[PDB]
Amino acid sequence: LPAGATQERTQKVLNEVTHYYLTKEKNNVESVFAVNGFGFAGRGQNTGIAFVSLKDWADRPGEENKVEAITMRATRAFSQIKDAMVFAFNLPAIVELGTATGFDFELIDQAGLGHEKLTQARNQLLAEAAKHPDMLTSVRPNGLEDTPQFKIDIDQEKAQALGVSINDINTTLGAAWGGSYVNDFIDRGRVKKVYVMSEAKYRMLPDDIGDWYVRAADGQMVPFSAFSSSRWEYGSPRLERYNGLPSMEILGQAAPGKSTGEAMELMEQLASKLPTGVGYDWTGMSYQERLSGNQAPSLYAISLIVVFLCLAALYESWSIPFSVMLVVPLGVIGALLAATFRGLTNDVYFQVGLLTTIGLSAKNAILIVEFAKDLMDKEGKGLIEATLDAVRMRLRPILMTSLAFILGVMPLVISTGAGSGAQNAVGTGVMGGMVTATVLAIFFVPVFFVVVRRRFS
């Protein structure tokens, strides 16, 4: 809900949201756990969450009754709502890890500028990011805006004149309006807290301030109106800090077609033209990339070297290894075809699938080359003769493993039930990769071996 909105107002929306899920999604939804008062961006009276629990996967058949479909319908249905941003969304696979898409930026007060000038600098940064939709999308603050607040000034002179102590004033105000934890007591053998607070009806509006009285030294009761003045101002309901300094967290992501590294490189540029004393830093997911970014190539640079060296020792040749190593794309192409065909992503299951697809195709190539080489080295046979005899011998075992392993992962591709997202990501990249790795290697490996041996006499 908007800023300044009350608990009741929020409850009305949550009741409407709950009423939708039990009526319109009656066949899918088992329960709706409505939590008025808590939101991830910042808790308060004007926010809430409804945790929707569904019936068993057996009672929700087909794509139409999955979370993807129900989410879309709910979000579309709740675009109607009277001034309230209400939207449904699925949980990420690892809730521990968070959402983990895009970037996590921190705008930092580096020179005691204060909340208001940091807000201005943040708005300057957001407005600049909005002028690059080609690179940046959904660039937003992960925090709350300023809200109206009631500034009350205790007049010290008038308090001293009437003989009212400031401790009695500030305790009367705080205890009544804010509550006060006095001490503990023992309810049925369990220690529990004792709070004093004003009954709801005497702590609601500015006129209720004047109904509270404080005893002076002389004995007379003095109302708050006698020694106070008040006015409306704006202030923060959620102040953020990062590494000890005032901050404002900015979330966002790279635009379609762009990498997060490009989007980060732009946000740094746009930050460098912000006002004096306004710095920045990367946190969370972005911190880990910024530090551990150059690893992915640097590790597999060594992998490629060790592979070459191992094959060199196996075959006793600096050149022959290349015939094996040229197999790598043959599996990768089919994986990429099978993934792109189905509209899946380049995820960890797919990526580990590539390494297993590559390794098995590499293994096949190693044995084809080994057989060919031994026929040449021991039996004195010619290049083409040995290559043809080698690939003949290895055709059957290659076809057997591929037949079994493609049929083994076949159910993981077609699977639509519980945990099917992961199974699909494992299955498709393996199946498609195995189909091309099998078909191509039997014809291409002899080509690689022959071409390499001719090139290096």
Binding site: T18, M400, G408
Partner: protein, 240 residues
């Protein structure tokens, strides 16, 4: 009690009458805070957010929690009911079962394929023995490295199953071929056949280690996930 707090003496007046705390205040057992309103299908609610202990079995714990909640059933007041809006245990029970089905089905498929080509029950048993030995053995290595049975490590084995199946098939097939082509007895055929491939298999282990082992040395959260697959696949492949 609320009665005792009500009887707290605030002052004694001049006329004699006593001002007690219940005169200037309502008194009740309430909540500590009133910011959160929790409901479950419109009805008032509370609950227990339960986390798994370090190194504990998630399925045992869930069964154990449900067992303890059952013992509490008889003593609840009228209207009180237990409900389970969030529970990872149904999902984890399915994830493991589907992986176990795939590994068993993979072994029967190899049996069907081995018989289709080689055409005797004797040879098709040899992978059916060797693959379980390697799979079981991998769990022992996972236990030694302090790893758990989880979604990532389980799919790590499903991805590895092609490499395990291949080691079994390559060895047996190559004996069946050497027996067919040269006519040597099984014992001598196996010596010659293993002579053709033992050097290669050792080279394949090193090469495959170099493909998978670097995946363990990624940093941060992404690298923790990659390391689960890496250790599982390197262990399975090394035993095979």
């Amino acid at each position: 009690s609320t009665e005792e707090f009500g009887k707290i003496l605030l002052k004694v007046n001049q006329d004699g009458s006593r001002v007690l705390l219940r005169d200037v205040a309502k008194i009740e057992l309430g909540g500590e805070n009133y910011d959160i309103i929790a409901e479950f299908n419109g009805q008032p609610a509370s609950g227990l957010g339960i986390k798994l202990a370090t190194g504990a079995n998630a399925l045992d714990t869930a069964a154990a929690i449900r067992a303890e909640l059952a013992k509490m059933e008889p003593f609840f007041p009228s209207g009180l009911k237990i409900v389970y809006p969030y529970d990872t245990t149904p999902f984890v029970k399915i994830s493991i079962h589907e992986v176990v089905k795939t590994l068993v089905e993979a072994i029967i498929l190899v049996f069907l394929v081995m018989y289709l080509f080689l055409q005797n029950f004797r040879a098709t048993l040899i992978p059916t023995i060797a693959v379980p030995v390697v799979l079981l053995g991998t769990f022992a290595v996972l236990a030694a490295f302090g790893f758990s049975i989880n979604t990532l490590t389980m799919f790590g084995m499903v991805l590895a199953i092609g490499l395990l199946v291949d080691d079994a098939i390559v060895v047996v097939e190559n004996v069946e071929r050497v027996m067919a082509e040269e006519g040597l007895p099984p014992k001598e055929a196996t010596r010659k056949s293993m002579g053709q491939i033992q050097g290669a298999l050792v080279g394949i282990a090193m090469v495959l280690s170099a493909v998978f082992v670097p995946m363990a040395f990624f940093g941060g959260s992404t690298g923790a996930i990659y390391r689960q697959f890496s250790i599982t696949i390197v262990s399975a492949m090394a035993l095979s």
